[PDB]
């Protein structure tokens, strides 16, 4: 099948991202050995992680292989390698990277960006469809494909929700990211569909800020806090990250109703799709 890659015929470009358990870096896969193969996007294990993320790492490429939609990024196969040194995952290339590094150099408006958040919102409704959750949605593991069309990405810390339950309860964070997460998942570890819809309202205020330093949720929450605990008892007192520069006040509402400190009163992916049109069509023109 040609979910098949020889890693023979993987000839390595250049590296072009790092995820949780994995490396991402260009290759060209040339049978012919010609230099005319097609551009695929390879992922790794990352050298420092010993045995015991082997089992994680299957998961993600396991999740992503049963996963088939416009706004997630493409599996495309898996390359083995013969000698026990690992298995690589294959995926489309898509060149222009990740919202987060896109985002600060070109001058996108209010309406491309809620078409962005509207994308990722129809990614995710699709993610939840098929009872997973994310757990590390942020503008750095959101990609673009060469028409601007997203595709979520970094599924390391993604599992499958037990049927008939609303959320998932984590063993063991190797990684947080504690400034998209949500109360429920600091104090009682525990991940709903409704805690990935907390750290899309995040995502959207990266989105808002162009991904700006010194407007990024670390650099906010650590001023508000004036670490985990104190970020705990900040968002239980109702503290929120402020409303970025010229963002419309309705934009704003939408991101707090996302942030709603009780987990099954925050709108769903499905809910938000059809206000995200709605506020873009609004914003154009
Ligand atoms: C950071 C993260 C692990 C989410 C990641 N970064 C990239 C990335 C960065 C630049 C670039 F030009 C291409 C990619 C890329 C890609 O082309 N395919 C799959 C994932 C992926 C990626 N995945």
């Given at each position: 099948?040609?979910?098949?890659?020889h890693?023979?015929?993987?000839?390595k470009?250049?590296?072009?991202?790092?995820?949780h358990?994995?490396?991402?870096?260009?290759?060209?896969?040339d049978?012919?050995?010609?230099?005319?193969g097609e551009?695929?996007?390879?992922?790794?294990?990352?050298?420092?992680?010993?045995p015991?993320h082997?089992?994680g790492?299957?998961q993600?490429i396991?999740?992503?292989?049963?996963?088939?939609?416009?706004?997630?990024?493409?599996?495309?196969?898996?390359?083995?390698?013969?000698?026990?040194?690992?298995?690589q995952?294959?995926?489309?290339?898509?060149?222009?990277?990740?919202?987060?590094?896109?985002l600060?150099?070109?001058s996108?408006?209010?309406?491309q960006?809620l078409?962005?958040?509207?994308?990722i919102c129809?990614?995710?409704?699709?993610?939840?469809?098929?009872?997973?959750?994310?757990?590390?949605?942020a503008?750095?593991?959101?990609?673009?494909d060469?028409?601007r069309?997203?595709?979520?990405?970094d599924?390391?810390?993604?599992?499958?929700?037990?049927?008939?339950?609303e959320?998932y309860?984590?063993?063991?964070?190797?990684?947080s990211?504690?400034?998209?997460?949500?109360?429920?998942?600091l104090?009682?570890?525990?991940?709903?569909?409704?805690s990935?819809?907390?750290?899309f309202?995040?995502?959207?205020?990266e989105?808002?800020?162009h991904?700006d330093s010194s407007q990024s949720?670390?650099?906010?929450?650590?001023e508000?806090?004036?670490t985990v605990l104190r970020?705990?008892?900040?968002?239980?007192?109702g503290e929120?990250?402020?409303?970025?520069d010229?963002?419309?006040?309705?934009?704003?509402?939408?991101?707090?109703?996302c942030?709603?400190?009780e987990?099954?009163?925050?709108?769903?992916?499905?809910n938000?799709?059809?206000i995200?049109?709605?506020?873009?069509?609004?914003?154009?023109?």
């Open positions: 099948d040609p979910t098949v890659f890693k023979r015929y993987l000839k470009i250049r590296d072009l991202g790092e995820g358990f994995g490396k991402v870096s260009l290759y060209c896969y049978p012919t050995n010609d230099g005319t551009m695929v996007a390879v992922k790794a294990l990352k050298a420092d992680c010993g015991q082997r089992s790492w299957k993600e396991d999740i992503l292989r049963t996963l088939y939609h416009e706004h997630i990024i493409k599996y495309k196969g898996c390359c083995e390698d013969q000698g026990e040194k690992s298995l995952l294959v995926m489309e290339y898509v060149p222009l990277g990740s919202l987060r590094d896109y600060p150099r070109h996108i408006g209010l309406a960006l078409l962005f958040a509207q994308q129809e990614g995710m409704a699709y993610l939840h469809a098929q009872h997973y959750i994310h757990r590390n949605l503008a750095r593991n959101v990609l673009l060469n028409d069309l997203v595709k979520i990405g599924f390391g810390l993604a599992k499958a929700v037990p049927e008939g339950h959320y309860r984590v063993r063991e964070d190797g990684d990211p504690v400034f998209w997460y949500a109360p429920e998942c104090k009682e570890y525990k991940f709903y569909y409704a990935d819809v907390w750290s309202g995040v995502t959207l205020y989105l808002l800020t991904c949720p670390p650099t906010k929450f650590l508000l806090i004036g970020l705990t008892e900040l968002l239980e007192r929120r990250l402020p409303r970025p010229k963002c419309p006040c309705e934009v704003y509402h939408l991101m707090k109703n942030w709603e400190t987990a099954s009163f925050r709108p769903t992916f499905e938000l799709i059809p995200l049109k709605t506020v873009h069509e609004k914003y154009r023109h």
